[PDB]
Amino acid sequence: ASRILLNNGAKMPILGLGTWKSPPGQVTEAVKVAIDVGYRHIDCAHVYQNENEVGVAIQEKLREQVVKREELFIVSKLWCTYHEKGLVKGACQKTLSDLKLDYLDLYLIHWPTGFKPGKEPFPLDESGNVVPSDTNILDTWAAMEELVDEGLVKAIGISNFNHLQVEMILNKPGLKYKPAVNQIECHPYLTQEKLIQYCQSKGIVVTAYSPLGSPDRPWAKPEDPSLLEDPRIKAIAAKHNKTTAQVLIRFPMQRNLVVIPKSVTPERIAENFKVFDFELSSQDMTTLLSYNRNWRVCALLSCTSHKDYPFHEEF
Ligand SMILES: NC(=O)c1ccc[n+]([C@@H]2O[C@H](COP(=O)([O-])OP(=O)(O)OC[C@H]3O[C@@H](n4cnc5c(N)ncnc54)[C@H](OP(=O)(O)O)[C@@H]3O)[C@@H](O)[C@H]2O)c1
Numbered sequence: 001a002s003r004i005l006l007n008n009g010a011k012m013p014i015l016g017l018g019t020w021k022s023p024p025g026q027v028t029e030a031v032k033v034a035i036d037v038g039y040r041h042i043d044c045a046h047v048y049q050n051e052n053e054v055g056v057a058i059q060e061k062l063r064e065q066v067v068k069r070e071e072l073f074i075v076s077k078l079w080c081t082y083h084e085k086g087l088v089k090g091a092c093q094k095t096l097s098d099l100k101l102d103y104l105d106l107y108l109i110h111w112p113t114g115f116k117p118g119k120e121p122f123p124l125d126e127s128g129n130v131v132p133s134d135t136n137i138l139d140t141w142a143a144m145e146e147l148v149d150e151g152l153v154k155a156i157g158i159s160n161f162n163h164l165q166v167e168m169i170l171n172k173p174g175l176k177y178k179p180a181v182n183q184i185e186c187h188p189y190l191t192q193e194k195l196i197q198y199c200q201s202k203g204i205v206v207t208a209y210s211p212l213g214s215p216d217r218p219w220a221k222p223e224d225p226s227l228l229e230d231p232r233i234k235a236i237a238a239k240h241n242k243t244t245a246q247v248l249i250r251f252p253m254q255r256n257l258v259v260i261p262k263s264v265t266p267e268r269i270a271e272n273f274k275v276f277d278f279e280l281s282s283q284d285m286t287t288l289l290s291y292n293r294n295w296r297v298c299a300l301l302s303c304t305s306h307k308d309y310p311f312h313e314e315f
């Protein structure tokens with residue numbers, strides 16, 4: 001099926017469009033093309049500095065009568081510098097304003113780490129370290145809950161949380177809403193078997209980000225592994241007369257994950273959606289899981305001393 005049931009009763013499309021590193025000069029057209037070829041889920045964030053332009057595209061296609069708001073599933077995330085209770089509603093309302101929406105379908109705590117409040121999204125000290133804020137995960141969760149109760153968002157969730165951090169929330173006395181989603185990096189080099197098992201056993205939906213290995217990530221090194229260029233995956237793709245990207249997108253769908261590949265190239269936006277017409281075999285799946293190397297695209301070294309850094313724990 002094309003959508004997965006969340007803990008709030010709403011249905012979430014399992015295939016969505018990613019928007020990190022989509023420039024404002026091209027993301028409006030990306031989203032318009034996306035909606036035209038069938039995407040209904042768009043993954044956004046204030047830190048991506050392009051929510052206005054995403055909002056332009058959504059607004060235009062509503063006006064064109066291509067889709068209705070109820071048909072769309074729009075996600076954004078609360079950035080690290082806004083974890084203070086008194087800053088959360090404002091941050092959410094900035095996102096809604098920019099996206100020209102009156103609600104979000106899902107709002108995530110982007111990272112478990114709070115950063116020093118201010119205009120700078122990555123506040124560093126003079127020696128390179130991120131400057132933390134004195135906020136904690138549960139106070140931030142409480143403030144996210146408030147957004148549901150005010151109707152600004154229909155569901156809340158988390159992202160880049162390890163299983164101990166998820167459990168902190170689950171075990172919160174007087175919890176109001178359980179997280180609906182944990183969005184994490186996931187691809188054949190970082191297969192996340194244990195955290196996926198944990199989350200699914202708790203009734204939390206997992207979204208896989210960077211499913212193509214984020215080749216456009218700004219800190220890529222020539223020597224890094226390259227998923228789209230892996231000859232082993234290319235051979236699985238050839239067998240199915242599909243591209244490597246289609247295989248990489250289909251792989252998490254068959255693990256009962258949501259997946260959010262990013263592109264601003266119209267041909268690829270279309271190509272990437274054409275993944276509901278074939279199945280990977282049991283052997284394909286096994287083979288792709290075997291490529292795990294615990295290799296993360298997303299893990300800023302300047303944050304490794306933060307008290308809440310998520311990736312010291314095994315999972
Ligand atoms: N929660 C978080 O912390 C977090 C972190 C990272 C990412 N995410 C979300 O997940 C999304 C996906 O991750 P990502 O942007 O890191 O990377 P990704 O989706 O793994 O890879 C995107 C890269 O692949 C290229 N690409 C797309 N389709 C292709 C195809 N069919 N053939 C060849 N190349 C193709 C894109 O190029 P073009 O765009 O130039 O076509 C871009 O360079 C993000 O955009 C964001 O929405 C969330």
Ligand SMILES: O=C(O)Cc1nn(Cc2nc3cc(C(F)(F)F)ccc3s2)c(=O)c2ccccc12
Nearest residue numbers: 020047048111112113298299300303306309310
């Ligand atoms: O955020 C995205 O969606 C993409 C993303 N990822 N990263 C790598 C990061 N690694 C982190 C690690 C922590 C940590 F929790 F681990 F401390 C906290 C925050 C971050 S940002 C970035 O540096 C970044 C910069 C601008 C826009 C998007 C991103």
